[PDB]
CAD protein
Amino acid sequence: KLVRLPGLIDVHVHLREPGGTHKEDFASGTAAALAGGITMVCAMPNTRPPIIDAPALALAQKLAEAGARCDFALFLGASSENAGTLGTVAGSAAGLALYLNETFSELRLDSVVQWMEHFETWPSHLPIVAHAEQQTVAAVLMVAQLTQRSVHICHVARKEEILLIKAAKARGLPVTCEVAPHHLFLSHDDLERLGPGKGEVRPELGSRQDVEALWENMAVIDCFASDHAPHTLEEKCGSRPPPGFPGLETMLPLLLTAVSEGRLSLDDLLQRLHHNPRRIFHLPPQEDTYVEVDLEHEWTIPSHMPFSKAHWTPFEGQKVKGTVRRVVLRGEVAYIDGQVLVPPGYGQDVRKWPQGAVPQLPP
Ligand SMILES: [Zn+2]
């Protein structure tokens, strides 16, 4: 017998629209997400143009309302210039994202006092996520303490990063975090097959000592998220290859593979993949939704996946067992074998529903 899960939530996806549409658009990557069992996504702002002001937010909102097959929320991105400007639109976004590593020209921040400015100005009741690596995690965690608010750490990938987040929680601090599936299943010993051109993720894949620390500290991980960062194989193979892994399709397969192996339970999965995203980001229920998946179908991961324009994947040749069966969204039927049945534009900004409104008390 098969099993029906809730509509699952992926809170870190790069969707390339606008300004990278040959890599993926909303329609392409919302489709990749349903063929992987995700019904709500959170879009990062490092598009071109970057989503760093109300006009670019409104532009992304209109492009996404007409192209998203599942539901979605959009991230504002913190810049050197926009601290204190975003108060009008802060509630429409998934939250504010801080790019504290790998300096995009227009998402770069010059100093920690600039990080302070955002933690002050952004309304202390809406989410804040952080692209922080290594000691930067300690640094952003400090600005959170000073400004007496929560912070969400992105793409945790190192033994010291996760250990640092565990000590921050056991001391009671309001910090949450996420782990990407490449850092959970691949390592340095998978880098001879993937080479250097397509082995590009930030943060880089680490050691099996790193991967084992993530699995041993599963109770610190709040959420899984893909870091679905799709490029073409022509781009990753060349001179300046952008880091980032296409993974909205690959994700729920491997996480389901592990559950059969004991590695973690199933309420272990839905807590990281549905309940906590709803919790942390004040996201709402998607009434009359669910995902049927099989739990014995043994397969191998292909050379690429059906729907994502990426047209490759570094999980090529991993034997999994678990497959997306059906996906159905708000009274209608979205995914059934090899094809998707909801059209570009069926999805909606969850922040424009009222139960997606983030609770706030007037102080
Ligand atoms: Zn990312």
